[PDB]
Amino acid sequence: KDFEKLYEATTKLVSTSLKVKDDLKKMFKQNGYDITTDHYALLRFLWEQDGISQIDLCEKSCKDKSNTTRILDVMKNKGLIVRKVDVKDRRKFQIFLTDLGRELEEPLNEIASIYATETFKSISDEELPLFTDILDRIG
Amino acid sequence: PRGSHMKDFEKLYEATTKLVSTSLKVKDDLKKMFKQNGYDITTDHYALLRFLWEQDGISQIDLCEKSCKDKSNTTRILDVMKNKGLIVRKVDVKDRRKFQIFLTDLGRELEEPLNEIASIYATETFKSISDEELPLFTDILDRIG
Ligand SMILES: [Hg+2]
Ligand SMILES: [Hg+2]
Ligand SMILES: [Hg+2]
Ligand SMILES: [Hg+2]
DSSP states (O other): OOOHHHHHHHHHHHHHHHHHHHHHHHHHTTOOOOOOHHHHHHHHHHHSTTTHHHHHHHHOSSOOOOHHHHHHHHHTTTTSSEEEETTTEEEEOOOOOOOHHHHHHHHHHHHHHHHHHHTTTTTTTHHHHHHHHHHHOOO | OOOOOOOHHHHHHHHHHHHHHHHHHHHHHHHHHHHTTTTOHHHHHHHHHHHHHHHHHHHHHHHHHHHEEEEEEEEHHHHHHHHTTEEEEEEEEEEOOOOOEEEEEEHHTTTTHHHHHHHHHHHHHHHOOTTHEEEEEEHHHHHOO
């Protein structure tokens, strides 16, 4: 409708995504926090709700089970989260924030806010839900 | 940074999240479709091949400007393409130390079957999206950043 246009949209979608992820990461680094966008998204779920099951974070995350688990080990190794074997299943892992994990909410949210305002500055508030809804119908 | 009409951070974050997820789903599904139909090609590969079908023998340098993925990642990906037999690296006759990138016979032949799959894929993927909506979507993506 027509392929050339469709391919161009797909490309822009995919550049933009990468640029977004990559600039937010840089901004966390510049302020001295060595974290990725993936780590931030995961931590956001936990700040809402601590003790999420790993499978539960599969679902919410996306990824494969391989990738998510590797991202979570990187996070544990930076001290943000710990991993417990569950009180309603040996099979399941529950995921808890450390103190470090809790502490970073204010500041990581602050940097993400600053990134967001600048990044979305040319776009109107009323364009968001259109954008969002077009993304939701893609696929 | 500020003004008199700020957006809600939550909304911006949700949009960023949806943008990211959707990018990933689209990439990953296109890759699955290529493999299911017998071609072991990533979306990154296919995207580079598109640039080569338009402009065979382009410089590594000019490929990176178009590519994004600024240098070491386009390169690593180019290497993987050479070892797949899709492309070939040729020292520039003019301008020392530049390379030009050329399609193999295999890389040329893939143009038709790979565009066929991607095209079908794109139409499915965008079927719920009206003709008026598309450049709107595209224009928002251009203003992001
Ligand atoms: Hg790309
Ligand atoms: Hg994500
Ligand atoms: Hg999963
Ligand atoms: Hg390169």
